[PDB]
Amino acid sequence: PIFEARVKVGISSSWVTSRKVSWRDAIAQIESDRIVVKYLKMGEVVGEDSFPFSALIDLGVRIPDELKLNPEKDHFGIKFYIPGRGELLVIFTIEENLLIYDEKKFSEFVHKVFEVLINGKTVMLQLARIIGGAVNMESKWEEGWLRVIKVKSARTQKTERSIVVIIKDKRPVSIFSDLEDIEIEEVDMNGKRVRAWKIRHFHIDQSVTSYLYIPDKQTQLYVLRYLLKYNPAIMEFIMKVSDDFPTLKSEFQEIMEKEIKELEALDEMEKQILVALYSGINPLELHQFLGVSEKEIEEIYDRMIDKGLLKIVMIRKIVDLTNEGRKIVNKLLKYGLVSM
Amino acid sequence: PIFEARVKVGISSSWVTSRKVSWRDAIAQIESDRIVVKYLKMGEVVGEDSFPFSALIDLGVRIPDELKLNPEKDHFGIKFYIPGRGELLVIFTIEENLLIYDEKKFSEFVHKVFEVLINGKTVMLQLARIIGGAVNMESKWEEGWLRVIKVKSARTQKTERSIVVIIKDKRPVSIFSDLEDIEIEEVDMNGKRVRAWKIRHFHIDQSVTSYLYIPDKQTQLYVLRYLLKYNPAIMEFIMKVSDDFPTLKSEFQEIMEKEIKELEALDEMEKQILVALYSGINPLELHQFLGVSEKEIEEIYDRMIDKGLLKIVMIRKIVDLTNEGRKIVNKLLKYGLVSM
């Protein structure tokens, strides 16, 4: 097999009155066309389930806390519709004991699932169709395939996991690195009306606009899921092109509402600190604007920082003369060494 | 003997032109009229100088650092003029080898010399001749004698070594407790006009000027040395009596000049920080007035404090948003929960 992992597996049946999922001991194997789950009693195998990629509806889905086992560890849910049973949520998660479970090995296992789903899937690409607001007449549609790789440049030169477009006779195009993204319809230069993606991405030396169409609707969802998971900064751009995907409009709506409630619940004083420091008020003077003492503000600065919200750039210290410090100054005056 | 000390003794002569002092080893005896030094080699008495308390010019003289044997140990210098030979400076110190000398019987040895020289000497007192600037003519001349004791009462109520005037059938007068001092000399003293001391002192309730005439001018020098030695705070108000005591005015000149040089040696920067803080400039803003960076001012603060001149009153920390702080503040106005 491509990859294995010893793991806890829970299967939901994902229906109303979702009963508590039952977790079993198994080792999970990635094949070319399926995930096979081999269940364990002691060290032995009692049975197995095969889950075809033919039936993979969605992956990387949002796991309710009611369905989490061991909320410290990470959970990964893959949703299939197998025709006989129905729509299933298969969730994989590792357990604490270090002699059975390995987090990095599990972390690779989930990544290989994306790699198998995405690598080699077909895509048509028209590279750099505007330059400086003028449409490139040398820009032709190219056929190619997706490849999940680490793209090491940005315009920032920060290495980031992404998906590139492999094209015949030219090295891959880093179509998801440095973005803006809208979605448009297009007359294919060969002739089809296509439901394609318009990407304003920072290309080789200049901001550019290229058109990208992924025929398989499923692999589009796969691509979006992975770009979210391993690069959460992008959550903005793709949410603009996220409407075609009901499972995402839902989850984005759900997280938005939780974020609202979380921000409501935050301490009003601490929210005030963040906005004032963000706007540019001197931290040494901030207590003066918010109507609070030096002692109390520094204590609140201590409660932040613990929360990871603030960082110390520098410690200033309020100092005063000792009796020996005064002895010097009074000597200087007595001998006519200072004016006052 | 009244008291003895085995010490390391060094003698300097105005007759010997070379500045050298050789530290012989001896026992030295306090007598009624003299101090006798039986010199000691291999624990055996090879020589003996007898130093009368008559022709004891001065004691507690300031010792040049050129003449100090062991700069840790105390050096007590007693100066005699022996007419056949000249002016002698006998310097007393110890090596405080823990079984041949000891520190604490040394520090008392010097004090007992003052006690022997001062106790019982005739003195004459006109107590509280001025109250509020008004002449008290119930204040008469009383004759008595001096005594070396610790006088508790001051305005700080803190005990201090001092000298009192004993009068028959009256408690002692603590004439050197809380003081200012001029020399008037015109007072008649129930007879011939004679040079006396005008002493402003707090006494019981009120700023009071009393007159004190110590007939023996050598005894006068001894009480002044004693007060200077064991209450060096008393130095001020004395120097108006630095006239008529030349060796005292010389030592005052040399101290102040050595102080002004020391002050000029201090860092120019640190002195201005000391004066500015003494004036009342905010320590957080002081770097601004001196045209210095915050990093350097806090560095200089740390070099001070160590030297004992400054003390931290409060710790203020300049604080900045983290990446997580920005996420929250970005989300707040992203959802319009904060107005900027």
Author numbering:
A (entry chain A), B (entry chain B): 2 to 341
Publication text:
In archaea, the adaptor protein CheF resides at the cytoplasmic face of the archaeal C-ring formed by the proteins ArlCDE and interacts with phosphorylated CheY. In archaea, CheY-P binds to CheF, an adaptor protein uniquely present in archaeal species, however the precise mechanism of this interaction is unclear to date. Binding of CheY-P to CheF induces a rotational switch of the archaellum. CheF forms a twisted homodimer offering two CheY-P binding sites within an elongated C-terminal tail domain.
However, we could successfully use the dataset deposited by Paithankar and coworkers, to solve the structure of the P. horikoshii at 2.75 Å by molecular replacement (MR) using our initial MjCheF model and obtained a complete model of CheF. CheF consists of two N-terminal domains and a long C-terminal tail that reaches out from the center of the two domains and extends into a long tail domain of over ~80 Å in length. The first N-terminal domain is formed by seven β-strands (i.e., β1-β7) and an α-helix and connecting it to the second domain. This second N-terminal domain consists of eight β-strands (i.e., β8-β15) and is connected to a small helical bundle (i.e., α2-α4) central to the two N-terminal domains. Helix α4 spans into an elongated C-terminal domain (CTD) that is formed by α5-α7, a long β-strand (i.e., β16) and the C-terminal helix α8. The asymmetric unit contained two CheF molecules, which interacted through their C-termini employing a buried surface area of 2700 A2. The strongest determinant of this interface is a substantial β-sheet, jointly being formed by the β16 strands of each of the CheF monomers. Moreover, both monomers of the CheF homodimer do not align symmetrically to each other but instead tilt their N-terminal domains by 90°. The residues involved in bending are E265 to L267 within helix α8 (obtained from DynDom47). This observation suggests that the CheF homodimer exhibits an intrinsic flexibility with respect to its N-terminal domains, which might be of functional relevance. Thus, our crystal structure suggests a CheF homodimer, which was confirmed in solution by mass photometry (MP).
